[PDB]
Amino acid sequence: TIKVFTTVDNINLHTQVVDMSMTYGQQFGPTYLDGADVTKIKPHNSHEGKTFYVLPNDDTLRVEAFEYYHTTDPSFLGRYMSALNHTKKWKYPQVNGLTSIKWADNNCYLATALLTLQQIELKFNPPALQDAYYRARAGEAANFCALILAYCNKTVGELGDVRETMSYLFQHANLDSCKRVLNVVCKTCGQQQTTLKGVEAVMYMGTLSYEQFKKGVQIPCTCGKQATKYLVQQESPFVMMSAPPAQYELKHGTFTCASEYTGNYQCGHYKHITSKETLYCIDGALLTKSSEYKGPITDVFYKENSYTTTIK
Ligand SMILES: Cc1ccc(OC[C@H]2CCCN2C)cc1C(=O)N[C@H](C)c1cc(-c2cnn(C)c2)nc2ccccc12
Ligand SMILES: [Cl-]
Ligand SMILES: [Cl-]
Ligand SMILES: [Cl-]
Ligand SMILES: [Cl-]
Ligand SMILES: [Cl-]
Ligand SMILES: [Zn+2]
Ligand SMILES: [Zn+2]
Ligand SMILES: [Zn+2]
Ligand SMILES: [Zn+2]
Ligand SMILES: [Zn+2]
Ligand SMILES: [Zn+2]
Numbered sequence: 001t002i003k004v005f006t007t008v009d010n011i012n013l014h015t016q017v018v019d020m021s022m023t024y025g026q027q028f029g030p031t032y033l034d035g036a037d038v039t040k041i042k043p044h045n046s047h048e049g050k051t052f053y054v055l056p057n058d059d060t061l062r063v064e065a066f067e068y069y070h071t072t073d074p075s076f077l078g079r080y081m082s083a084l085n086h087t088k089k090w091k092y093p094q095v096n097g098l099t100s101i102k103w104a105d106n107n108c109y110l111a112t113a114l115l116t117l118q119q120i121e122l123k124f125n126p127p128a129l130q131d132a133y134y135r136a137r138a139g140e141a142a143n144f145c146a147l148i149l150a151y152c153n154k155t156v157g158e159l160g161d162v163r164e165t166m167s168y169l170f171q172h173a174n175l176d177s178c179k180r181v182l183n184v185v186c187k188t189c190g191q192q193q194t195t196l197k198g199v200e201a202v203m204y205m206g207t208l209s210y211e212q213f214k215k216g217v218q219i220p221c222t223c224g225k226q227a228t229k230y231l232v233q234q235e236s237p238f239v240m241m242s243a244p245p246a247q248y249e250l251k252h253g254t255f256t257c258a259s260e261y262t263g264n265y266q267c268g269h270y271k272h273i274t275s276k277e278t279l280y281c282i283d284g285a286l287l288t289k290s291s292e293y294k295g296p297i298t299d300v301f302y303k304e305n306s307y308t309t310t311i312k
Helices: 059-069 076-087 108-117 127-137 142-151 162-171 210-215
Strands: 002-007 014-018 031-033 051-054 179-186 190-197 203-205 217-220 226-235 238-250 257-262 269-275 279-283 286-290 293-303
Touching: 059 127, 076 142, 108 127, 108 142, 108 162, 108 257, 108 269, 127 142, 142 162, 162 203, 162 238, 162 257, 162 293, 210 226, 210 238, 238 257, 269 293
Parallel strands: 002 051, 203 238
Antiparallel strands: 002 014, 031 051, 179 190, 179 226, 217 226, 238 293, 257 269, 257 293, 269 279, 279 286
């Protein structure tokens, strides 16, 4: 017989003694070692002393699972371990002082999101996400990338959209203090003010330019006549401006980072543009730099703290 450790969070470890005759699935249930399904695998000698991930089978494991992951989905652990099995074999090179991902299994949208998260201020609510976030910034982003896929209900190889991945991650972050006050202007109905909170206060779909959002954009009113919507007040550490892929010029120092999308719908490829001392383009493990940039951009990220418009 061998002595092992079972856990759901890799923190609260539980001591267990197993029988080498019965497989792990008969004694613990669905069991995993470093992302590998060891349910139908009998206990081995190298397995002694190692820590095993198990699906919660009692209330103590269930409670511990929620405190770390903030989910009660019984499929989360398996989807997490299934993604981890791939992400542990990916390469995570340091590029321009940032942790990127060598291209594999259509992970270009994951690398772009990973590079973006290292350049904006964000705090994740699930301790599992925050801990992996920290380790990702230090260069060990395998667990973080697997968690992103599990939280987004995406599998390795699936075609991913960066704007949708960021929105899913934003919903698992503390954006309660983020406030956005808007104002619509219609020739017939008049002027109406709205206040957005949370994820809706930091994301917009329609234009890439934060300045254009401040000046105003044409949105259709409920009466038929076109209206004008502009930003009144913004209280957030950042702002994400999105638009369908189109040719766009990125000026050095006017933005934080941006998402470049080339190719067909869903089947395209992502690249990451970041504004440093000069404009840098990160394509997985490849790095290029230029003083100017013009290309198909679909997301742009800007810095912010507090903004109040001057329009009367
Ligand atoms: C890469 C990718 C993976 C999946 C995916 O779809 C999953 C969606 C489907 C609906 C629900 N969710 C599962 C889309 C893409 C993709 O290609 N994203 C680029 C940036 C893109 C966006 C838009 C567009 C226009 N409006 N909105 C709101 C987004 N249009 C594009 C037109 C041409 C080329 C790229 C476009
Ligand atoms: Cl929650
Ligand atoms: Cl959740
Ligand atoms: Cl790719
Ligand atoms: Cl979700
Ligand atoms: Cl959460
Ligand atoms: Zn939560
Ligand atoms: Zn793989
Ligand atoms: Zn969720
Ligand atoms: Zn009206
Ligand atoms: Zn109107
Ligand atoms: Zn790709």
